[PDB]
Amino acid sequence: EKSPQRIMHIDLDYVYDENLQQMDRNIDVLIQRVKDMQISTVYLQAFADPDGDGLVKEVWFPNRLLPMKADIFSRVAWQLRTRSGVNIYAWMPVLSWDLDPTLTRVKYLPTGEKKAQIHPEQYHRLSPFDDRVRAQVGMLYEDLAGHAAFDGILFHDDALLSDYEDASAPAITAYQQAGFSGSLSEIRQNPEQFKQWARFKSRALTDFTLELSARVKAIRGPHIKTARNIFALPVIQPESEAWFAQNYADFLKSYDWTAIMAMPYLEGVAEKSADQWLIQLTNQIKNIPQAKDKSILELQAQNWQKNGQHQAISSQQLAHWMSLLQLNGVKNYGYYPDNFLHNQPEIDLIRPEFSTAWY
Ligand SMILES: CC(=O)N[C@@H]1[C@@H](O)[C@H](O)[C@@H](CO)O[C@H]1O
Ligand SMILES: CC(=O)N[C@@H]1[C@@H](O)[C@H](O)[C@@H](CO)O[C@H]1O
Ligand SMILES: CC(=O)N[C@@H]1[C@@H](O)[C@H](O)[C@@H](CO)O[C@H]1O
Ligand SMILES: CC(=O)N[C@@H]1[C@@H](O)[C@H](O)[C@@H](CO)O[C@H]1O
């Protein structure tokens, strides 16, 4: 993969239309847009997400376990790879799949409550400590690998656990067999075990993704690249691994690419403070030898609302941030999401700061 990496992170929900002729024209416009952008890589959504409700119910490829909304991942992928000049990473949830109800869900232990529960503001994750979950998610990745050709896998940011998770019964068994003492409440407040417990969960998530990678590689071959989205806080505030179960050094060792969600508004940073936040992030990265060479900084192109009506970030603002990254010595970056239907971000404003081939 030739340097630098410039990544468009693309949902196919926009492309989908019940009218097949319209969907055809949509795909054509998308392929041309990516070609015109002249960048290196597309992270391409393989799952449907029409409602943004943190749970995958349908996918864009034929498979054994979930409804196929439309057979379009493979179709878009091969055209992007041959007409638009990009590598394609299949973007897949790690855990948040609407599978058999008897499969174990991740739960958290609420303060003051005895029974573990599912938090409504979190991804609706299956538990990585349930071996049948591992098998069935494995089957989904195998079905993707068998039907479509691509260059890499992007593991979704839903591979995370808080310091009150996973409280499910199979997770409890896993902790017990690993030597952890007492209840989840006791472990997480034990000075001598809570850091080890955090690391155990981080390793469990990573090991699960590496199992999935191995299964895809068994089908498509060894050259398949891996990437995983990491939240910004585990990078800039490493103690936060306690409530993310993500470790930046672990990512850098385990994956070809660590896709950092360099998204200040997502993190609640004020508009007037966002640039400084990004500078501090890049400083932290540059202080770890060679980290920047295996990291992609992923900027946000929408400002997401709990309300649900997301708001676009101006093309000028996105270009400004891209310029900021370059000026601070960061050459690998991209953005999420892209909206071909409205030329948002505006290709003519973004290319000068995004395409190495510009002017
Ligand atoms: C935070 C996040 O993932 N937001 C995405 C949004 O950018 C995208 O346009 C929409 C359509 O797929 O789905 C949402 O989930
Ligand atoms: C509110 C809802 O139905 N689902 C949300 C989803 O929108 C969000 O992307 C995810 C991660 O915060 O958490 C889920 O619980
Ligand atoms: C069958 C099932 O899992 N139902 C849960 C529900 O009990 C919970 O209140 C809600 C919180 O988001 O998430 C649902 O998935
Ligand atoms: C507020 C803060 O800075 N960090 C908290 C952490 O102390 C807490 O244990 C965790 C609970 O899931 O939520 C984080 O946001």
Curated annotation (Swiss-Prot):
GO molecular function ontology, one term from the record: hydrolase activity, acting on carbon-nitrogen (but not peptide) bonds
Localization per record: Cell outer membrane
Cellular component GO terms, alphabetical: cell outer membrane
Keyword match Signal: yes
Keywords of the record: Cell outer membrane, Hydrolase, Lipoprotein, Membrane, Palmitate, Signal
Top class in the EC scheme: hydrolase
UniProt note: phenotype after gene disruption: Deletion of pgaB does not prevent PGA synthesis but does block its export and biofilm formation. The synthesized PGA is retained in the periplasm and accumulates at the cell poles.
Topology versus the membrane: Lipid-anchor
Biological processes per GO annotation: carbohydrate metabolic process; cell adhesion involved in biofilm formation; macromolecule deacylation; single-species biofilm formation
E.C. number(s) listed in UniProt: 3.5.1.-
tRNA processing listed as a keyword: no
Biological role: Catalyzes the N-deacetylation of poly-beta-1,6-N-acetyl-D-glucosamine (PGA), a biofilm adhesin polysaccharide. N-deacetylation promotes PGA export through the PgaA porin.
Domain-related comment: Contains a N-terminal polysaccharide deacetylase domain, and a C-terminal domain required for PGA N-deacetylation that may be involved in binding to unmodified poly-beta-1,6-GlcNAc and thereby assists catalysis by the deacetylase domain.
Family statement: Belongs to the polysaccharide deacetylase family.
Name of the protein: Poly-beta-1,6-N-acetyl-D-glucosamine N-deacetylase
Organism this protein belongs to: Escherichia coli (strain K12)
Origin organism lineage: Bacteria, Pseudomonadati, Pseudomonadota, Gammaproteobacteria, Enterobacterales
Gene: pgaB
